[PDB]
């Protein structure tokens, strides 16, 4: 597992030299952006369970083939594993927001999941739909534009970091697909 | 005699180590100083004359000095104190580097 | 590769739980101590060559029997391997000052070094002589700021306790 | 940690029988080459003997959850079996000894298996993350973790695990496959939960079935003598004659230590 | 009971290694964020009674069927059990604000609550109504310092996600 | 496991009330004393292995019955377990310095060790001697008065914290005895 | 403590079976080679003092830095610790020549020696210098019978490979 | 398949260590006892047919009820299965005399034989009658040397204790 710091260091070991000035400059931008990252993680982790609830309920509510008998959401225990997997995915994405680098998500969760869901018969397109809904809801809570929660923070620019979180969710959506 | 010679060696390897290393740093320093160029005023003084000779006998660089007539050795007659620039300026010398190891 | 980030992320991953407020306080501590650490990293990447030069010169200043006959540096080549190894250890102290934990210094330099050092007949006390010279060598404020000096001492002491 | 003197004999004898089942030839098998450098089995020995004190340092509640759950799962391992019901219920060291003895003579573990392809492997990361979840009931780590106790032991432990996957790559086909069916039986029985699709998962993958253990997640290890020396100057604990499971959990009923 | 201290101490104890510089950075973060948290704890211990009173009053303001016949508070005594439970949860938010992690709130209040609440027919959504009313009611400038308000919101949100 | 914060909380739960003023005041003194605690832990953990080496070699020096054949310090495997245990004890004491409360040392190391060393035949008196040597050397490194290392720090008062560390080592010395 | 007896008895005990003919052939090999080994044990217990004396004297003859003011034998006492350690290693070679396997030499002398030697800052190469001097020292037939000398070389080489 | 070689190599492989002197003594014992064993193997491969013939004839000489009606050899074919099985057991005694341990005799003949013998209603005591006849029959020096016979008796007794 690699944060921003370990990514700078391992890339510097690929160049096989000392860390250098420009890499530290990008790292200073990270540390000055630090409290925005912290408050962003606090936003998503606060509203997390409700994101999972809305995302998976919306996922079923697009196509009722999941809830049809013979669908993969057809029973209580399948639905429990469904909501559980949504919670797990959101957990590792929140880890990727704290770390600043996607290597935690690549190693802990992403590696070997497509062949897993293919082996179980889980429809991967519906999972990518749920990841897309978690992406939209997560950017909405991270930009304080949610219609159900308006938390108060000192105003600033957080669009870059929204692009980071959207990059992680697009990594998951391209990971199962 | 054996035990006490071994007692002797300690208090000396401190100061002897520092003196040797200081000589090496000074060596690099002087060599880079002579390579950067010698100004007119320094070349008039004795130290500049024998440092110019130092550079000549040791093949570090050629330093333009003063022609036997007295007028400064120019390559192009427009500007004073020029030197030939090619293919030896770009070859690195081992006396410039502190680090011989890498 | 341990840092604050990998410790709290690995811990909360082990709980299977979202990162609570305590992890957030820890990483906020990382971004507090980061200024002193990156200062020392900038300065180490400033003068690493003179550091390695005085370190190796003191290393053979203490133990002379290495350069005498036998089972050690008996060439200019092997002394170049010596100064390359001290270049590696200063490069690892640079990396551990960038990361802020002992992670890359441990998993790259420390782990399994003991079988290599007992196998190739390399005595570790010579390294320890070099590092103790460097730690004694750096002043509180002339070389670097005091907060960064402390950080550098900490990392280098960790190397010595790994190696002694 | 100390076990009563009736216990150590019963568990030790049970250990000896499952070692006989696991290796009948007496040419020592592949599964217990223990270590590939010569420092290695010693360091393994010291880590394991120290782990027991780290299990004795757990809070009382967790000890009793271990104890009664080992009792229950040990009876499930008996197959009805009223006599070994009596013997297992009466002696708690011997229960965990019988669990690890059966599972390790049947070659149950993922330490003996090799996953091939991403589907089986992730499945292992899921099952592991269940048990790692079940051990740590908060972000605070448990006291049962203990990879090393000093510096640099942990890296050795890394070398054992990495050196032990290769032996899993080495076993013969016959052995790999007795492992398959045996691991099927260990899962389907030791759970004893008749779902369809669960047994479909165990049908699909014996490596899912390989990682089946107690609800707590860590198999109690068996040690010949917990914290008893080889030196002359051993003080042994003088155990009382009645002993129910809470009494080796809580260590009440020891009294003095008497012997030079 | 999780905090920064027990997380890094438990982690390094699991490694069997001394506490290195990274743990020290983490605890130094704890002693940075401590000022805001203890401010919120002082103020909560200031007006906990009015907080619990408005919380319970809003809790029966939303769901009235509890006080109607049946399988819920049908006495002054059971409504006293109600206000006592909200007293407990505010006391645990106080404790978790003192410690700085979700430790005592989890291991005292959260864990195993679900079997109790499904057993004694206690619907969790009423608690959630109380805490949301409390969360909405808090004003940063009037109630407490803004940094502190964030800490309080975080803890209370944690309660809701534990309970929903 | 309990730090100073958890000790305040659990004592407040014994009183069964809220936290209050005076306990938080003592906690503010802890947090203002925080960097002295950090620097103290950095001092002991820096000089740690050398403390263990001097401590056990000195313990052997006082009485040679341990190194006599039939003693417990006889041979390498025994001596290795001896040095190992010294490292372990020093580690938990350093944990008690970070935590500020002795509960980590009480649960993780102290509980069940006297009975253990009695069972193995380890002489406990000699271990209390080694813990005393670690105490003296540790207070000497923690007050910057060691004759082998003089680290530079801003001068100040740290005697209270020296009394804390001395209290933990006396807890260990009274624990094996 | 490994010998032929403990290997075959431990193996057949691991099978849970009576000792078959192969074990009997092995111990009959032990009672064939026993004559040469016990000859060398008698002679080692003959002149152990001169062996340890020339061993330690060659040990300080090679490395003289050992006697430096800090970090090794800097007393007559520590050189007495040196000669006592070489007394121990010759006593273990005597024991391993009596047993016939590397058992007591391993479990008394070899196991865990490396943490002690890296902790106490004692270089292993000095031991190795002493043992290589002793092995170069003995002629096969003048001092002892030809068969024994081989056995002694084997044991001492095992010490060197344990220690290098 | 146990021999001296597989026991000591499997043991030292289990230690992860090079083969010490004790293993070397054991295999040197194998190459001492090999002469007597291979002598008996040469002579067994000499007259195996008459051995099996007198063995089976004595086997039906003791128990006649096998050849009477019932649940046993009631054909010339099944008595040919009898003489073929005694051919197999003498072939396994030959193999175990070549190897020198009970290895191939165990893993080919002995292991799992008991379920087969209890399943196909084959009484083991008839085999035991045959082998006791062969062991009683052999002379000290008529077809083999005195030392060699002992080896044969040992192997055949092992068969009986495996089968009784
Ligand atoms: C560490 C990461 C990690 C994950 C990401 C999950 C992935 C995962 N999901 C399931 C298993 C499952 N996952 C789902 C989820 C789904 N229900 C649907 O309607 C949707 C298509 C989808 C949610 C978007 C379901 C229903 C099951 C059970 C499938 C079944 O038994 O039929 C399994 C098999 C084991 C089990 O039954 O739990 C695994 C490994 N597990 C992990 O360990
Ligand atoms: C330990 C926990 C912890 C946190 C949760 C954060 C909380 C935090 N955020 C800011 C401060 C801030 N937080 C945000 C965040 C944003 N503003 C927006 O309008 C977006 C909705 C949102 C995107 C993430 C901004 C923009 C600032 C002010 C700019 C800045 O300080 O960089 C500050 C500065 C001090 C202050 O404002 O009083 C702090 C302490 N820091 C911590 O230490
Ligand atoms: C990433 C970190 C990193 C290191 C720290 C080094 C450590 C290291 N050094 C050597 C190898 C070596 N290192 C030295 C150095 C020494 N000469 C002496 O006189 C002194 C005792 C000492 C310098 C102080 C020498 C001489 C060798 C070669 C030894 C030999 O071949 O005999 C080797 C074996 C491979 C090789 O030959 O290069 C390694 C792994 N390598 C790494 O990859
Ligand atoms: C990153 C780590 C790092 C170090 C460890 C130092 C180490 C170091 N110090 C000096 C150089 C020096 N270091 C000192 C320091 C002092 N000498 C005294 O007698 C005082 C006691 C002491 C201050 C307390 C001095 C005075 C010099 C210059 C002259 C000398 O060599 O002593 C030099 C040569 C270059 C120079 O002149 O600056 C180097 C490499 N530099 C670094 O960059
Ligand atoms: C990767 C694949 C994979 C699986 C297939 C599961 C298999 C599995 N199930 C459980 C655990 C469980 N599984 C069930 C399920 C059952 N409830 C019943 O009524 C039925 C008999 C059955 C569904 C058909 C239950 C109830 C538990 C909890 C058992 C208990 O705690 O008593 C556990 C122990 C850990 C836990 O508590 O979650 C595991 C490993 N886990 C995995 O990682
Ligand atoms: C978590 C905390 C923790 C500890 C504090 C130790 C305590 C401890 N020490 C030993 C074991 C031991 N401890 C020592 C130490 C001693 N040698 C002497 O000469 C002195 C009297 C003494 C050092 C001062 C020795 C020699 C052994 C091995 C004893 C033997 O096998 O004879 C054991 C048994 C397991 C083993 O062999 O390692 C345990 C539990 N272990 C732990 O897990
Ligand atoms: C992450 C690692 C880490 C550390 C290692 C400490 C290091 C540290 N110590 C102090 C600061 C200090 N440190 C000490 C310590 C002492 N002074 C004495 O004379 C005694 C010898 C010694 C007893 C322990 C004192 C007295 C101060 C100043 C007083 C104070 O700040 O409380 C400061 C304040 C800032 C500064 O001084 O520039 C810092 C950051 N903090 C950290 O975050
Ligand atoms: C139990 C172990 C044991 C040993 C390892 C030897 C070691 C040993 N050798 C000698 C002594 C000697 N050792 C030798 C042997 C020889 N010198 C040569 O030049 C030849 C190459 C080589 C024969 C192959 C000789 C010649 C002496 C006497 C002179 C000398 O020191 O060389 C002495 C002094 C006493 C004496 O003179 O006998 C000792 C202690 N003795 C022992 O009892
Ligand atoms: C590699 C070693 C090896 C052996 C030693 C044999 C052992 C053996 N014998 C039989 C099987 C048999 N063996 C006998 C022999 C007997 N008839 C009697 O009157 C006597 C009691 C006895 C001879 C002394 C008979 C009769 C059968 C057939 C039994 C039946 O079908 O009823 C079988 C079952 C398969 C079969 O029918 O052939 C086996 C495994 N086979 C092997 O592969
Ligand atoms: C029952 C006697 C016996 C034993 C003890 C045995 C093998 C055995 N298991 C051993 C240990 C061992 N085996 C396992 C795997 C076990 N745990 C699991 O979850 C799975 C499914 C397992 C099935 C046995 C673990 C986790 C360990 C401890 C890890 C460690 O000690 O490194 C060992 C010790 C040496 C080693 O590290 O491999 C040995 C030698 N084979 C046997 O027949
Ligand atoms: C009738 C069946 C039905 C539903 C159920 C919803 C489900 C739903 N929520 C969405 C998306 C969505 N949902 C929420 C979360 C949610 N909003 C909040 O402000 C709070 C507090 C929440 C939890 C209580 C957010 C924050 C978004 C992002 C849009 C937004 O800004 O509100 C989206 C848009 C998906 C997309 O962008 O692709 C859908 C479909 N829609 C339906 O048609
Ligand atoms: C309590 C923690 C613990 C362990 C785990 C063991 C591990 C262990 N096995 C050893 C050594 C060892 N182990 C085996 C293999 C093993 N024995 C068999 O007969 C069969 C069938 C085996 C695999 C199932 C053999 C064959 C030996 C050699 C000793 C012997 O003859 O039995 C040795 C001695 C190492 C040495 O000589 O340096 C150790 C330490 N010891 C411990 O303290
Ligand atoms: C493939 C062979 C192999 C292993 C076996 C592991 C062993 C291992 N565990 C570690 C370290 C380690 N181990 C645990 C304990 C463990 N984790 C938990 O969350 C729970 C519940 C546990 C017991 C079940 C913890 C808590 C850590 C500290 C790292 C972390 O935060 O997880 C470390 C790091 C050591 C260090 O930091 O120097 C290693 C090498 N690694 C390997 O390569
Ligand atoms: C002859 C057998 C023998 C020994 C071995 C020593 C061992 C020893 N060290 C002590 C104590 C001691 N030891 C050290 C550590 C040590 N000093 C340093 O400056 C450095 C760099 C060290 C590691 C290399 C310190 C720092 C102290 C505290 C005293 C001091 O200020 O030096 C004390 C005092 C114990 C006490 O106060 O109760 C003793 C007995 N004494 C003996 O009689």
Structure, explained:
This is part of a larger assembly, with two copies of chain A (177 residues), one copy of chain B (102 residues), four copies of chain C (164 residues) and one copy of chain D (260 residues). Chain A has 177 residues and is mostly helical. Chain A contains nine helices and no strands. In chain A, helix 3 (34-46) runs antiparallel to helix 5 (76-99) and helix 4 crosses helix 5. The longest helix of chain B is centred in the N-terminal third of the chain and has 35 residues, at 2-36. Chain B starts with a helix and ends in a 45-residue tail after the last helix. Chain D is built from eleven helices and no strands. Chain D has helices at residues 5-22, 40-56, 60-78, 82-90, 92-105, 118-135, 153-170, 173-191, 196-204, 206-210, 246-250. In chain D, helix 1 runs parallel beside helix 5 (92-105), helix 2 packs across helix 7 (153-170) and helix 3 packs antiparallel against helix 4. Chain A binds chain C through residues 1-3, 5-6, 8-10, 12-13, 17-21, 24, 27-28, 31, 34-35, 38, 41-42, 45, 48, 88, 90-92, 94-95, 98-100, 104, 108, and chain C through 1, 3, 5-6, 8-10, 12-13, 16-21, 23-24, 27-28, 31, 34-35, 38, 41-42, 44-45, 48, 91, 94-95, 98-100, 103-104, 108. One phycoerythrobilin sits between chains A (35-36, 38-40, 42, 143-144, 153-156, 158) and E (33, 146-147, 150).
Strand content of chain B: under 5%
**Percent of residues in beta strands of chain A:** under 5%
Number of helices of chain A: 9
Structural class of chain B: mainly alpha
Estimate percent helicity of chain B. 40-55%
Structural class computed from helices and strand pairing of chain A = mainly alpha
Write the H/E string of chain A, N to C: HHHHHHHHH
Write the layout of secondary structure elements.
The structure is cut from a larger assembly and holds two copies of chain A (177 residues), one copy of chain B (102 residues), four copies of chain C (164 residues) and one copy of chain D (260 residues).
Chain A: H1 4-14, H2 21-32, H3 34-46, H4 48-62, H5 76-99, H6 103-110, H7 114-120, H8 124-142, H9 159-176
Chain B: H1 2-36, H2 40-44, H3 46-57
Chain C: H1 4-15, H2 21-46, H3 48-62, H4 76-99, H5 103-110, H6 113-119, H7 124-137, H8 146-163
Helix pairs in contact in C: 1-2, 2-4, 2-8, 3-4, 3-7, 4-5, 7-8
The complex binds phycoerythrobilin (9 copies), phycoviolobilin (PVN) and phycourobilin (PUB) (4 copies).
One phycourobilin (PUB) sits between chains D (19, 23, 28, 32, 34, 41-42, 45, 48-49, 223-224) and G (2, 6-7, 10-11, 14, 106).
């Amino acid at each position: 597992m690699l944060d921003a710091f370990s990514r700078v260091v391992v890339n510097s070991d690929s160049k096989a030299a000392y860390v250098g000035g420009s890499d530290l400059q990008s790292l200073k931008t990270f540390i000055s952006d630090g409290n925005k990252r912290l408050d962003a993680v606090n936003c998503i982790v606060s509203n997390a369970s409700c994101i999972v609830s809305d995302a998976i309920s919306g996922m079923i509510c697009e196509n009722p083939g999941l809830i049809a008998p013979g669908g993969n959401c057809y029973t209580n225990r399948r639905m429990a594993a469904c909501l559980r997997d949504g919670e797990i995915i959101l957990r590792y994405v929140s880890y990727a927001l704290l770390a600043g680098d996607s290597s935690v998500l690549d190693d802990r969760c992403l590696n070997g999941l497509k062949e897993t869901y293919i082996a179980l018969g889980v429809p991967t397109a519906s999972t990518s739909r749920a990841v897309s809904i978690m992406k939209a809801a997560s950017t909405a809570f991270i930009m304080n534009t949610a219609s159900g929660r308006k938390i108060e923070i000192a105003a600033g620019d957080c669009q870059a970091l929204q692009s980071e979180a959207a990059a992680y969710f697009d990594k998951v959506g391209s990971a199962v697909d | 005699v054996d035990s006490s010679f071994a007692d002797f060696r300690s208090s000396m390897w401190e100061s002897r180590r520092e003196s040797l290393t200081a000589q090496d740093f000074g060596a690099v320093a002087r060599v880079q100083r002579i390579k950067n160029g010698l100004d007119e005023k320094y070349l008039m003084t004795l130290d500049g004359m024998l440092d110019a000779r130092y550079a000549r006998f040791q093949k570090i660089a050629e330093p333009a000095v003063l022609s036997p007539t007295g007028t400064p050795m120019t390559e192009i007659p427009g500007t004073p104190y020029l030197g030939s620039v090619g293919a030896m300026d770009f070859i690195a010398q081992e006396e410039e580097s502190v680090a011989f190891w890498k | 590769m341990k840092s604050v980030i990998t410790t709290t992320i690995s811990a909360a991953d082990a709980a299977g739980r979202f990162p609570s407020s305590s992890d957030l306080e820890s990483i906020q501590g990382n971004i507090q101590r980061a200024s002193a650490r990156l200062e020392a990293a900038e300065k180490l990447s400033g003068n690493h060559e003179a550091v390695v030069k005085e370190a190796g010169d003191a290393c053979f200043a203490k133990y002379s029997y290495l350069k005498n006959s036998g089972e050690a540096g008996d060439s200019q080549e092997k002394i170049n391997k010596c100064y390359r190894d001290v270049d590696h250890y200063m490069r690892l102290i640079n990396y551990s000052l960038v990361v802020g934990g002992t992670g890359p210094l441990d998993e790259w330099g420390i782990a399994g070094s003991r079988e290599v050092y007992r196998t190739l007949n390399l005595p570790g006390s010579a390294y320890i002589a070099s590092f103790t010279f460097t730690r004694d060598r750096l002043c509180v404020p002339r070389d670097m700021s005091s907060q960064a000096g402390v950080e550098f001492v900490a990392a280098l002491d960790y190397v010595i306790n790994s190696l002694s | 940690l100390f076990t009563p003197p009736v216990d150590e004999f019963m568990a030790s004898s049970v250990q000896s029988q499952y070692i006989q089942k696991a290796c009948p030839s007496g040419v020592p098998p592949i599964q217990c080459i223990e270590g590939v450098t010569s420092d290695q089995p010693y360091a393994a020995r010291t880590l394991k003997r120290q782990t027991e004190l780290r299990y004795h340092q757990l809070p009382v509640a967790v000890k009793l959850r271990k104890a009664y759950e080992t009792r229950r799962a040990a009876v499930v391992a008996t197959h009805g079996c009223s006599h070994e019901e009596g013997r297992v219920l009466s002696y708690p060291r011997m229960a965990s000894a019988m669990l690890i003895g059966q599972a390790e003579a049947s070659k149950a573990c993922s330490r003996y298996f090799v996953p091939n392809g991403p589907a089986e492997k992730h499945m292992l990361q899921a099952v592991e993350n269940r048990y790692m979840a079940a051990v740590n009931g908060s972000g605070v780590f448990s006291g049962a973790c203990t990879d090393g106790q000093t510096r640099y032991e942990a890296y050795l432990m890394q070398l054992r695990g990495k050196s032990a996957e290769f032996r899993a790559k080495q076993y013969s086909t016959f052995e790999k496959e007795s492992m398959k069916y045996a691991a099927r039986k260990q899962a389907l029985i030791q759970k004893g939960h008749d779902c369809n699709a669960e047994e479909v998962i165990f049908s699909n993958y014996p490596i899912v079935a390989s990682a089946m253990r107690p609800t707590f997640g860590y198999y109690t290890p068996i040690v010949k003598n917990p914290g008893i020396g080889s030196v002359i100057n051993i003080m042994r604990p003088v155990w009382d004659k009645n002993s129910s499971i809470s009494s080796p959990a809580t260590l009440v009923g020891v009294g003095g230590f008497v012997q030079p």
